[PDB]
Amino acid sequence: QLSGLLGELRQKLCAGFPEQAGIQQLIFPAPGLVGRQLLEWLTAQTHFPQFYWRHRDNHEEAAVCGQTRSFADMKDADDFIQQNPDANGLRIWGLNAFEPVMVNAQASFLFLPRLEILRRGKKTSLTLNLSSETSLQKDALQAITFIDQLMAARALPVLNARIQHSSHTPGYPQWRNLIQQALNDIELDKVVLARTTTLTLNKPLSCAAFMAASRQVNHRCYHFMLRFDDRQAFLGSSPERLYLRQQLHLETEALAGTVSNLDSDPQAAVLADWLMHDEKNQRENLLVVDDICQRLQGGVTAVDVMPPEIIRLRKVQHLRRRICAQLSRASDTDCLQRLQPTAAVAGLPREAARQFIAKHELFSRGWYAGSAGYLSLKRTEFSVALRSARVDGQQIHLYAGAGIVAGSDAEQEWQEILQSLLEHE
Template sequence: MHSITAALENLLGFLSDDMPEAPGSRIFDTSFPLNDAFDPLSWLCSQTQFPQFYWQHRNGHEEVAALGAVRQFTSLTQANAFLLQDQPTLRIWGLNAFEPENGQLFLPRLEWRRDAGKATLRLTLSSDVSLQEDARQASKFLTTLLPSRTLPTLSGELKGERHFPDHAGWVGLIDAATDTIASGALDKVVLARATDLRFATPLHAGAMMAASRRVNLNCYHFLMAFGAQSAFLGSTPERLWRRQGTQLKTEALAGTVASHPDEKQARHFADWLMHDDKNQRENLLVVEDICQRLQQDVNALEVLPPQVIRLRKVQHLRRCILAELKKPDDTRCLSQLQPTAAVAGLPREQARRFIENHEPFVREWYAGSAGYLSLAQSEFCVALRSAKVTGEVARLYAGAGIVRGSDPEQEWQEITQKAAGLRSLLLSE
């Protein structure tokens, strides 16, 4: 018998017990042996219930497939308030928009989770009225689940491609930004481009995620499917924060150079990045901003030496930041850290206004964050190297940090390199 079948039968057995006609929450966990070829992404994408959320940590040790919503939240603040009602073991998954007061997060009905070498399948009940009624709903939910199907091959005929802004618009945008920086109104602004790829037939977001997962190593992989034809996904190298109790880890990932399949050439580029004044300055601006924002909320703060992170298409400059929080507060972490100077600019509010007034598209989930929160710990990655899939259209996003001396052509090349991580999966050049 397949592991998933046995685990679901165990969960149905738990629901046969009498449940009270009273409000509350209950969790049922069953072990899940990792001795077969079960792929949580394929299983998740085979289901007809939504929302669906897939997550794989950048170090590979944790993987999650969350399905169906017991409760939904339109902001992290709302989700955190629910957890503070004495819900110590629940995890809530989802997205925070670029404007962090907006979100789409949910407490999943069913959550498959692998942590290191151990996997569990969790069923959650939660009701403001009757656990007995929610147990009936959960039982019905389990009986409608479908067997896992192999994800389709990612292929399609490209019918059109359009950039927002186009090249001429980008040059004008960068000129406006550098003029504003020269006037002293901004130190830095991060500007982005959206690229719509229109195909002849609808795209399969799960197949796109699987293809990215295979080749974009050292990245967080995430997929939020809102419905059968609508999803947001990405493979991003950047952590926004990880909190365990009062211990916080965050990072400044800013400064970019091309990668290369040849090891010697890649090291040459990395050495240049470590010594380039513009990129070092861009990274340190982010570090200084993060440290200033956290200063009132921490007892201790440490910035580690710079590293170069090598990805498939690009390499980045990264400085990790460790802090001890005065109290564990994910709502405060989100408001202080998102958007960082690495995705918005400095000063933050002025940069956000410049983006809102000048970028020819709305960022929505792009440059927001994806992950989970619980009372014990939380982790969110920055939603970069990402795409919105709507029917036959994939909208790809990429951005670049603009500072004094930025060149529009170099920045255009940089965002093209960044977008290539997902674009190359959809198109055979």
């Protein structure tokens, strides 16, 4: 049981630590079962921030709780990892915003956790970070307090809140006016325009319960959840990787080109076949591949692209091409700066899109369309923060986007553009 492990950890904290500045990791192998109960455990805790992570591959999962250091941008988080080459498995977790957020506004919210429970495959480990500018002994003491204030994991509370009001930002007329502004500008090749749906609920959303419902239905997605405190969070279920880095190995992907999914496997297969052989959709995917390659080229010794494949998601099926590279340097700062924001969330041409969005979108995307995941010296992975939502007491703001092209009608785009999970009052 986790309770046994937490006692062993506590015992070790009670032995000495230097009364001098430092950093240390206490790493305890955990029972595999603990790795299957991570959302249950995280959300019972009253310590913040909290970050939950489940890889789209079902093989990596984490619950991280409390903080020992926080960084407001990737550069500073990266610099801290580099200054600790010694410390294997020093992982920093969190969010890189699309646009800086008041949490000065910060480009990222990245933190070295107090406690990290990480599952990879069948092996789970618990890690407690100690950190101080003066005394690791002082910090060990605070860590004992933190441990004594942990709560027992409990089964997940039922998804209960109900919608009593909905509104849209932008509203339809502004959406329509904005899209006209992009159709006139296209005479720009493509711009992706965001819309928030603000649901007002009869009570505070259980983030736990919402995350659990999204996991049951949104397969093949990275699930992430950052709770800043017991009222504010950002969470989502994105099918898309920004990048994976293993030493100088990098993977990313062009995820672009769509057809509907259908519950019937063979009906779905038939549409995937169509998608696989559709020129228009294939071209859209390849221009994404070209942008990504263009952004990587000065930082790689090699880049290459695999054959296209189909990702079958709950309502849609996508064309995907993995892009593999060898980096010149191992710098997560540089990776992020090159890959984010992606063309998929902004449009083409890259800078023409970013500026249109910057000029005309009236509302900040904040965390939406940025990324979620972790960094470390040898391994880093971020998912693009798509299909995501800001929880704010009894309100939830759901994000979505629409790519706008020469042929696009505002009303059709509105009809196309997580809410599924909640029922009305």
